[PDB]
Design a binder for these strands. Structure first.
Ligand SMILES: [Ca+2]
Ligand code: NA
Ligand code: NA
Length: 275
DNA sequence: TCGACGGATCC
DNA sequence: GCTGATGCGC
DNA sequence: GGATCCGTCGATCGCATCAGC
């Protein structure tokens, strides 16, 4: 079992956290709201909330989402021609300077996976990375995605400090899942997916916020299959990340795993920055 | 993720 | 709206 | 030749679609 440590809300130089970002693969936004997700969000009170795998077109967005005046600026992306699949959202207390959808590549911008929100001091990207598939049927596609995404993020980070959050659909290293041996040909732990993640960290470059602070902490996961009672056994994967520009590391206060928040087969993760 | 399967392969 | 089947996925 | 091993290999859970009416 795993117990996330208490929230560190001061920076390495003693500056108080001024910004709290929460990211959560809700795996069915309507179901997550029915499973009381927005109660949990309201007690966490983030300044920005990023959601993945909403599986909900904009028309079907439940009413409860306009009853949250702390996250009143809301942006949504859905697949162009495939309903109930993928989907992401970004809700913010303050309006961003600019919002865009996708990474600027037609091939990869059709499944509602990416929202980019530019603020004063940084750019925030939230992403739902495409799963490599059962039988690895989409691994070849995933490797092309990885190359296009890496390139996109490198470009962005060259202009403003970057924060990338969301479900990146890879457990980087053997410490990031419960059963590394049995999963090296399964989606999320292929050498191709792990190599892509490493290349992302090096080429942009980006740092893995949680591992920067807790480099040797095992059993810390963000996702558990619904089957086989995995979550109660903590047989999980760390698939949800906050990746940061190296320049933001002195602003980094903490990177949390909200293990006990139910409502999905992923738990939320939370980032504190002193900006 | 778990167990049932099968087909090496040591004692 | 309801049933039954298919898609997709830690 | 009875008992362990180790590469596959199906059925689980959950959400949302779709076809039909
Ligand atoms: Ca499928
Ligand atoms: Na390894
Ligand atoms: Na630096």
């Amino acid at each position: 079992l795993y117990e996330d440590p208490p929230d560190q809300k001061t920076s390495p130089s003693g500056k108080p956290a001024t910004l709290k970002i929460c990211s959560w693969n809700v795996d069915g936004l309507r179901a997550w709201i029915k499973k009381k997700g927005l109660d949990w969000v309201k007690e966490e009170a983030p300044d920005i909330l990023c959601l993945q795998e909403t599986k909900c077109s904009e028309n079907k967005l439940p009413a409860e989402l306009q009853e949250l005046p702390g996250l009143s600026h809301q942006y949504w992306s859905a697949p162009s021609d495939k309903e109930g699949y993928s989907g992401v959202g970004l809700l913010s207390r303050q309006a961003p300077l600019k919002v865009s959808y996708g990474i600027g590549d037609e091939e990869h911008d059709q499944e509602g996976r990416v929202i980019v929100a530019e603020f004063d001091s940084f750019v925030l990207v939230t992403a739902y990375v495409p799963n490599a598939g059962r039988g690895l049927v989409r691994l070849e596609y995933r490797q092309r995605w990885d190359e296009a995404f890496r390139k996109f993020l490198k470009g962005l980070a060259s202009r403003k400090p970057l924060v990338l959050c969301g479900d990146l659909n890879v457990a980087h290293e053997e410490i990031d899942l419960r059963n590394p041996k049995g999963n090296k040909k399964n989606a999320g732990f292929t050498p191709q997916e792990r190599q892509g993640f490493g290349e992302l960290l090096q080429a942009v470059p980006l740092a893995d916020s949680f591992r920067h602070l807790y480099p040797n902490t095992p059993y810390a996961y963000t996702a558990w299959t619904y089957m086989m009672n995995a979550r109660s056994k903590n047989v999980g994967w760390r698939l949800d990340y906050f990746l940061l520009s190296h320049s933001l590391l002195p602003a980094l206060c903490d990177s949390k795993i909200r293990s006990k928040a139910l409502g999905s087969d992923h738990c939320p993760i939370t980032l504190y920055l002193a900006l």
